[PDB]
């Protein structure tokens, strides 16, 4: 039970731009020994991790409301179809490598890019 992420997506064919709205997460686990987390979301398209976005860090909350919008530029249709959108949720730490809470993967060929997509998705297990 890793929590849930709510997001929306809007693809503009004329401009070759993908807008991703990271809305909120709910029911995240407390990562440290006192049961708290400092979550933020990293968003990037794979295979090309040359452009990544990261939300602000929300201190000490398991139900952060991010309300942040990011726009991937220079993604014409021919290039975007083979990519996968990754939402990676991390627990911020001042001193050491940040632990990943979980992730959401959205293959771009598995959705309708002609509609505004808004949905909740369960987090799946982190890498490692």
UniProtKB/TrEMBL annotation:
This is C2 domain-containing protein. Belongs to the synaptotagmin family. Residues 1-121 form the C2 domain. One of its GO terms (biological process) is calcium ion-regulated exocytosis of neurotransmitter. It comes from Octopus bimaculoides (California two-spotted octopus). It is found in: Cytoplasmic vesicle, Secretory vesicle, Synaptic vesicle membrane. Keywords: Calcium, Cytoplasmic vesicle, Membrane, Metal-binding, Repeat, Synapse, Transmembrane, Transmembrane helix. Its main location: membrane.
